[PDB]
Amino acid sequence: SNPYQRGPNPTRSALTADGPFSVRTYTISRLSVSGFGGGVIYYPTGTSLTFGGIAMSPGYTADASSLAWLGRRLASHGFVVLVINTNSRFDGPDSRASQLSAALNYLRTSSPSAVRARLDANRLAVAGHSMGGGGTLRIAEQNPSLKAAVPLTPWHTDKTFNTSVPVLIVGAEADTVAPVSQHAIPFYQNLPSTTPKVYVELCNASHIAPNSPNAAISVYTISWMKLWVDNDTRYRQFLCNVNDPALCDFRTNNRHC
């Protein structure tokens, strides 16, 4: 009766490993597309169903490979995931917001046939690392039709994003590049009080925790995307009445439970 429901009843353990869908990759050449630097698409095979689309941005100096594990992880749980390369490695967060927007337009309109075959063009979301997480907050502000936004150890000089898109922010306790007291936690506080929002803080984690396989980032990112992109309420259990020793802080307005 939920037409967007995919995959088996989830367990926390299952969300710390690649999920039930086999994954394809398609490399987008830089010169093949306008408005972003290409990147990599991760998408399901072995299926007739369609899935929400996620565009994800890496951070300053970084490329799509810095989030390859997470693009694969998300796609293997039932998503079409485009991890962008930026026009320049030195692009700022608002430039990365524009590039996520171009990437999502590309995904819905001129991506390969096999990608288009797996995409529900009306169910889209964003995520990103560091300045890519600041871009994630900005694109959410600019596009209220987005279903969800997951900034990972986000960095931005602007602290207030007027978005109605449900936001889950991951902070890293030991982050020296985007300290949670100056970036992640202000972003969380300044989001409208009427927007569903969660902040989780990883115990002992550095700014580069998102660039390696990370059980907590996998669980919270998959769960937020499933709940909002797929309306999959089977994932509320991971975001409500949370007991997880990987987390050293948790804030929410409880609009997702």
Side-chain angles (χ1 to χ4, degrees):
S1 184
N2 178 181
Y4 307 130
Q5 185 183 298
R6 308 289 177 256
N9 293 327
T11 69
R12 201 211 85 260
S13 159
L15 305 190
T16 69
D18 290 353
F21 297 91
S22 301
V23 176
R24 301 292 197 223
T25 64
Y26 174 87
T27 298
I28 315 164
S29 69
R30 169 169 185 92
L31 298 188
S32 73
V33 294
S34 296
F36 73 106
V40 181
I41 319 180
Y42 303 85
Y43 55 107
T45 183
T47 183
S48 290
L49 302 170
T50 59
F51 304 89
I54 300 171
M56 298 200 37
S57 179
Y60 192 73
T61 77
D63 63 33
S65 69
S66 72
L67 295 177
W69 79 269
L70 185 58
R72 171 169 305 277
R73 180 58 54 80
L74 283 166
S76 73
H77 281 274
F79 294 99
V80 177
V81 184
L82 168 39
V83 183
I84 69 163
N85 288 312
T86 49
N87 292 329
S88 166
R89 299 190 320 286
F90 305 124
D91 288 333
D94 289 343
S95 172
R96 290 167 194 272
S98 303
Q99 297 186 62
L100 283 171
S101 184
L104 282 181
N105 181 68
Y106 158 87
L107 194 60
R108 308 173 84 227
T109 63
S110 63
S111 54
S113 173
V115 174
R116 284 300 295 286
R118 299 280 68 78
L119 177 68
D120 182 338
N122 293 325
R123 299 187 295 120
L124 308 174
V126 284
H129 177 42
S130 193
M131 282 181 188
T136 293
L137 283 158
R138 177 69 73 200
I139 187 175
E141 177 174 77
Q142 293 161 339
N143 299 267
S145 71
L146 300 177
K147 301 300 196 183
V150 178
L152 302 170
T153 70
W155 188 99
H156 208 313
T157 54
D158 296 315
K159 303 299 169 183
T160 303
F161 300 94
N162 182 12
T163 184
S164 55
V165 176
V167 173
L168 187 152
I169 292 155
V170 177
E173 183 180 21
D175 192 330
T176 61
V177 174
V180 295
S181 66
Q182 292 175 305
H183 295 275
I185 295 166
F187 300 148
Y188 171 89
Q189 295 295 3
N190 297 333
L191 286 173
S193 56
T194 54
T195 301
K197 55 186 183 178
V198 168
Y199 170 71
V200 305
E201 189 167 315
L202 301 177
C203 301
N204 296 313
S206 75
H207 193 66
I208 63 167
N211 307 126
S212 290
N214 182 287
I217 287 171
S218 184
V219 166
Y220 295 105
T221 306
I222 292 162
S223 299
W224 199 248
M225 295 297 184
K226 278 287 193 175
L227 182 60
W228 292 112
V229 177
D230 296 357
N231 303 146
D232 193 345
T233 59
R234 295 181 300 168
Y235 287 81
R236 278 197 187 125
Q237 56 181 305
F238 309 105
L239 296 157
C240 307
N241 306 307
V242 175
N243 203 68
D244 183 356
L247 304 185
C248 276
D249 201 356
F250 196 108
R251 313 293 180 88
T252 185
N253 56 359
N254 266 318
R255 288 180 183 286
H256 63 281
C257 292

